[PDB]
Amino acid sequence: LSPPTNLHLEANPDTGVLTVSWERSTTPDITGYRITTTPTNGQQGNSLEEVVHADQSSSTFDNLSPGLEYNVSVYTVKDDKESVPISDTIIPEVPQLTDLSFVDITDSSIGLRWTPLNSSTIIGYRITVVAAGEGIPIFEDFVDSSVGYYTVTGLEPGIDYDISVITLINGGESAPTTLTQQTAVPPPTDLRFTNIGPDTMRVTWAPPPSIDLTNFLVRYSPVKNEEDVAELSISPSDNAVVLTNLLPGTEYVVSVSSVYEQHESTPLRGRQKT
Amino acid sequence: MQIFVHTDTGKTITLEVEPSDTIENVKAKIQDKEGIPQDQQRLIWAGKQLEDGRTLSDYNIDPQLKLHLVLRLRAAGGMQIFVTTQTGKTITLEVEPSDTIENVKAKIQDKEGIPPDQQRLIWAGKQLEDGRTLSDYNIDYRFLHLVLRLR
């Protein structure tokens, strides 16, 4: 009496159903198959059994627990006798979101959007934000199973973030579905040079919108010697600076950068002769 | 309705209650199941602490949704947030989401001697304005590592 071959275990996380299938035994005149599903935790009285006819090559098991290992064994049955079983293990999972996306992206907030999953075991979702570089958890919340939208605020300009949504059941959770977000600090624009005397000039720029910065960074040097660069730090509430002690008849290159703590915008550059 | 109480170690305690049930009745059930005294318990909903002698309905909790709460022990203290100074020194503050921005500045003066009128507090690019509470900016217990920038 030969066992079945080609045992396949399919634990669908979206429906919670385990489908057991196999290739029929080569033995002539079998009278069926016996299928057992048992958690491999040594807990007695929790084993499940199905019996199917000889022309059947599949069976199902409902309501298995995610995260718990089960052993599935299929016996070829021929009247009084059974084969040696074919067997394999499987650990059902909690379904994870599949269409998590960023929406409604503003300078100060990002919107998370997803389709709520259609399973009655889901008790809600856990939303976490982690600064990806240092692995520091920044933010956590929990929402009901019907919620498919969330507004995340408080992301530092310049920092890369891992933003995850985790499907929760009673006593279980899915692997996180993760997106990454990094918002660069916006540059200043509209660089202008005035009050241009022989050794002095006024530099003005338009600040970026809708961000309160820590400061501006001004870098300036003669075009023909970058190694002579000078730097000034400018208050984030001011949009101009007076450069002094400049070389006469010399073209300077000037750059202004937005700064939020350690992170800089792309530079706003211009050139101007004294 | 079902309640799910998330603890600091990642555990979830489940309860089944009525909207007329009081907060302190929920702590009482957490006490029986975890041994944590009722007076050590703080229950947080959407980052805000729920107060005793109120029903869940008094918080406008929708009774057809699953309610998700956070348990924090009084021994853990208040929100621990960080403030980095003009120079880049990190200091530690303990606040409540109901603190006002001036309360917060008062604490920084207590530790660093910076008069509150000299303090400009920025949160992730947004200046925190006097006359508001942290809550008004949605700065509450859901932020696990909050950093304010001083100048």
Residue numbers in the entry:
A (entry chain A): 1174 to 1447
B (entry chain L): 1 to 151
Lines from the paper:
The crystal structure of the Af2:7B8 complex with a resolution of 2.3 Å shows the modular architecture of the Affilin, which comprises an N-terminal Ub-like domain (Ub-N) and a C-terminal Ub-like domain (Ub-C) tethered together by a two-amino acid linker. Ub-N and Ub-C display the typical β-grasp fold of ubiquitin and bind the target 7B8 in an elongated conformation. The asymmetric unit of the crystal structure contains three Af2:7B8 complexes related by a 31 non-crystallographic symmetry-axis. The three complexes demonstrate that Af2 interacts solely with the target domains EDB and Fn8, with no direct involvement of Fn7 in binding. The two Ub-like domains of Af2 form a total binding interface of 1179 Å2, with the major contribution from Ub-C (811 Å2) compared to Ub-N (368 Å2). Target recognition by Af2 is based on three sub-interfaces (I-III). Interface I between Ub-N and EDB includes evolved residues from the α2β5 loop and strand β1, but also native (non-evolved) amino acids from β1 and β5 of Af2, which interact with EDB residues located in β-strands C/C’ and loop regions BC/C’E. Interface II is formed between Ub-C and EDB, including evolved residues from the α2β5 loop and the non-evolved R149 from β5 of Ub-C that interacts with EDB residues from β-strand C’ and the EF loop. Interface III involves interactions between Fn8 and Ub-C and does not comprise any evolved residues. The most striking observation was made by the discovery that the β5-strands of both Ub domains of target-bound Af2 have slipped from their original position in the β-sheet (as in the structure of Ub-wt18) by several residues towards the N-terminus.
